[PDB]
UniProtKB/Swiss-Prot annotation, chain A:
Belongs to the V-ATPase H subunit family. GO terms for biological process: endosomal lumen acidification; Golgi lumen acidification; proton transmembrane transport; vacuolar acidification. It comes from Saccharomyces cerevisiae (strain ATCC 204508 / S288c) (Baker's yeast). The lineage of its organism: Eukaryota, Fungi, Dikarya, Ascomycota, Saccharomycotina. It is found in: Vacuole membrane. This is V-type proton ATPase subunit H.
Length: 441, 33, 33
């Protein structure tokens, strides 16, 4: 196979070879012809253990004729072994390149039959398509669109199948047309990649995560695909950074750094906007600063981390605390940021809050109302957000008192009164402080 | 075969650099046109 | 890996220079037309 050296590929090949059907037995059961049985036996002796060569067509015909699951698994295992073998496999790939019917038959066999047989056939098809002459974007797209490939990729329990699928996609990503096909497949099944990234952030799993990161980086190599994937998941960069920080593997960290840089690379559209959004939301600058302080054995990974840190510092140089506050308000997430407890920041941002008919004050009132609606859950993060919103409302009432009337009109006083009866002690104290700042002493 | 895979991965990076060179062709083409 | 990495820099420069010449050649055809 193309990536038969992987543990998942070896396990799939062993599973396929476990269900083996003899060519003579298939011929006896009218599942193959005598010449087809002889060709299948020759191929089995050559690969599973003489090369069939031109006889591989009779073996494929016998496999198609033998609809039994065991026979299909044996044929897939023989094909995978031939692809792994140096003498064999290459001849089959050349024949498929010369005759598109053979390539079409191999593509149809891929992701078909038994799960082990489907995996072996897909690996054989990927190995055949590895050659430039036999490469076909349409065949790769058809194999990806198969339900078996999607099930293998989404098989959380079957980590080996997902790792094999990710490795096959990464290998196919070299060809630009196959790279576009892999990008389309990623756009279709981004949920599997997101789940893999979340599992890595929170062995077979490590290899699958590394393959997924490599495929993501290969897709992001194209600026259009990177720009499209940037808006697909705003938290993808944060998840990748968390996985890189958690993972100690140099290769995985380097791949994550390259993927993060590709999204913020100048080639991708809205590079400055994407970098600013990443720094404001995922705290790219602090993570990059922490990574720079940490020592990495790999020189390439260290250089990538240094470049990412420089890019984050350049992006944060233009940004200010006001941009961070605006991003936090837009994301409706507040965890007692330094600006909330900074008297100078509130004093210098009081006019900005009341600007545009107190647009920031209205947004804060809406966030407080949403937290009050979400106050039934009374989660720790929700309680912290509610307390931060109450503190911000108290500050915007103490300074620029004109906003107090707007808050009262928008139900801010009612929200504060409702929060005064909250079970949480901190929320009740914050609401009492806001009420005291409103009309109290 | 582990060393060959690293060279092949680096060879893929050479193709990516060549693709980057092909990207500069678009900028050069607009000036000639 | 280092040998192929060095070829990436050469590919990024040789292909870009060759592609720029091709664009100039296309401009000559447009001027003749």
């Amino acid at each position: 196979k193309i990536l038969m050296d992987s543990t998942h590929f070896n396990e799939i090949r062993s599973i396929i070879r476990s269900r083996s059907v003899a060519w003579d037995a298939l011929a006896r059961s009218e599942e193959l012809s005598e010449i087809d049985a002889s060709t299948a036996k020759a191929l089995e002796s050559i690969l599973v253990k003489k090369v069939n060569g031109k006889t591989l067509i009779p073996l494929i015909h016998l496999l198609s004729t033998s609809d039994n699951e065991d026979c299909k698994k044996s044929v897939q295992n023989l094909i995978a072994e031939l692809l792994s073998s140096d003498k064999y496999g290459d001849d089959t790939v050349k024949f498929f390149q010369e005759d598109p019917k053979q390539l079409e038959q191999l593509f149809d066999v891929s992701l078909k039959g038994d799960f082990q047989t489907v995996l072996i056939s897909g690996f054989n098809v990927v190995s055949l398509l590895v050659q430039n002459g036999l490469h076909n974007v349409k065949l790769v797209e058809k194999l990806l669109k198969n339900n078996n490939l999607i099930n293998i990729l989404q098989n959380i329990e079957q980590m080996d199948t997902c790792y094999v699928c990710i490795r096959l996609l990464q290998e196919l990503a070299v060809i630009p047309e196959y790279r576009d096909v892999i990008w389309l497949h990623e756009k279709k099944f981004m949920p599997t990649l997101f789940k893999i990234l979340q599992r890595a952030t929170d062995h077979l799993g490590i290899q699958l995560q590394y393959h997924s990161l490599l495929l993501i980086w290969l897709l992001t190599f194209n600026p259009v695909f990177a720009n499209e994937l940037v808006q697909k998941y705003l938290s993808d960069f944060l998840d990748l950074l968390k996985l890189v920080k958690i993972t100690i593997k140099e290769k995985v960290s380097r791949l994550c750094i390259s993927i993060i840089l590709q999204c913020c690379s100048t080639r991708v559209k809205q590079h400055k906007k994407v970098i600013k959004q990443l720094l404001l939301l995922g705290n790219a600058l602090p993570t990059v600063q922490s990574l720079s302080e940490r020592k990495y054995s790999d020189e390439e990974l260290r250089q990538d981390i240094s470049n990412l840190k420089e890019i984050l510092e350049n992006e944060y140089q233009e940004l200010t605390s006001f941009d961070e506050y605006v991003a936090e308000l837009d994301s409706k997430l507040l965890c007692w940021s330094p600006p909330h407890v900074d008297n100078g920041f509130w004093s210098d941002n009081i006019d900005e809050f009341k600007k545009d008919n107190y647009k920031i004050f209205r947004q804060l009132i809406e966030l407080l109302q949403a937290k009050v609606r979400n106050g039934d859950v009374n989660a720790k993060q929700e309680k912290i957000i509610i307390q931060v919103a109450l503190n911000d409302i108290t500050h915007v009432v103490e300074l620029l008192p004109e906003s107090i009337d707007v808050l009262d009109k928008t139900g801010g006083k009612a929200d504060i009164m409702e929060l005064l009866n909250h079970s949480d002690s901190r929320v009740k104290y914050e609401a009492l402080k806001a009420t005291q700042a409103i009309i109290g002493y | 075969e582990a060393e060959e895979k690293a060279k092949e991965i680096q060879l893929k990076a050479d193709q990516e650099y060549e693709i980057e060179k092909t990207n500069i062709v678009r900028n050069e083409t607009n000036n000639i046109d | 890996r280092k040998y192929r990495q060095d070829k990436l820099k050469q590919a990024k420069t040789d292909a870009a220079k060759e592609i720029d010449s091709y664009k100039i050649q296309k401009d000559k055809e447009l001027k003749e037309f």
